[PDB]
Amino acid sequence: MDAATILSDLSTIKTDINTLTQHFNEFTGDLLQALAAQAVEQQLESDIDQATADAKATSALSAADSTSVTNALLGLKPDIVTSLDAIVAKKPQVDSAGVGSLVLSDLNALQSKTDALSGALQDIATATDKDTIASGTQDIDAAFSSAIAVFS
Ligand SMILES: CCCCC/C=C\C/C=C\C/C=C\C/C=C\CCCC(=O)O
């Protein structure tokens, strides 16, 4: 509903991602581990959708708020790349657990939901910040495409 809400929403997303990465780095193929990570992944999906809804409810951002939201979104990029790298690194464990289709389903959902979030933030950012967001989102989308290719 306002810029502070969107920033808080983006921080929650950041926390979710870093928690997932921790799960990935511990994954041994065990299905209970997979269940635990999927719960976090589903929380992440919900949190991204919440951010999108809050952004859709928000008026054209001041210059300072636009910078804040742009930097918070772009600040997710290395966390996303790190997280995607971490699950890719565990492809053998994913294959042995037989849960590749779940990873793939999750990746496609997350890409869709993240793209929607970026679109909504572009809509309320300054003209310059929109371009910056779009550019960073291209990079996030590239990273998703690579992970999807690995898991399909
Ligand atoms: C918005 C940025 C997205 C960052 C990447 C986040 C998730 C990658 C997608 C799916 C992986 C998560 C759960 C799938 C379930 C089991 C696979 C092993 C999980 C584990 O380790 O037990």
Side-chain angles (χ1 to χ4, degrees), residues 2-152:
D2 55 33
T5 302
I6 295 166
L7 295 170
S8 179
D9 289 343
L10 291 169
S11 186
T12 294
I13 292 160
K14 190 182 192 87
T15 301
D16 293 337
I17 293 159
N18 291 321
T19 302
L20 273 175
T21 301
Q22 287 179 308
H23 282 267
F24 302 153
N25 290 331
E26 292 170 2
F27 187 49
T28 67
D30 176 89
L31 214 50
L32 279 179
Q33 289 187 303
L35 182 75
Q38 179 67 189
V40 183
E41 188 280 341
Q42 288 284 108
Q43 191 57 57
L44 173 54
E45 290 192 16
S46 185
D47 291 338
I48 292 164
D49 287 348
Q50 179 64 244
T52 300
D54 287 337
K56 288 188 187 173
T58 295
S59 300
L61 297 175
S62 71
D65 287 346
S66 184
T67 297
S68 294
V69 166
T70 297
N71 284 19
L73 180 61
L74 269 40
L76 299 174
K77 180 205 295 184
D79 298 344
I80 292 164
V81 171
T82 295
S83 195
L84 290 170
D85 286 345
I87 186 64
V88 164
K90 293 288 187 294
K91 187 168 189 294
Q93 288 67 33
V94 169
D95 292 338
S96 74
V99 299
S101 69
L102 183 58
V103 175
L104 186 58
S105 180
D106 287 355
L107 287 168
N108 284 311
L110 287 163
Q111 184 169 23
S112 181
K113 293 174 184 301
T114 301
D115 288 350
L117 173 55
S118 173
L121 295 175
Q122 287 176 48
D123 277 339
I124 63 175
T126 65
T128 295
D129 284 347
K130 165 168 180 188
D131 293 333
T132 298
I133 291 168
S135 300
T137 302
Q138 288 185 264
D139 295 336
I140 292 173
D141 286 332
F144 272 118
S145 301
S146 179
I148 290 161
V150 168
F151 285 100
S152 52

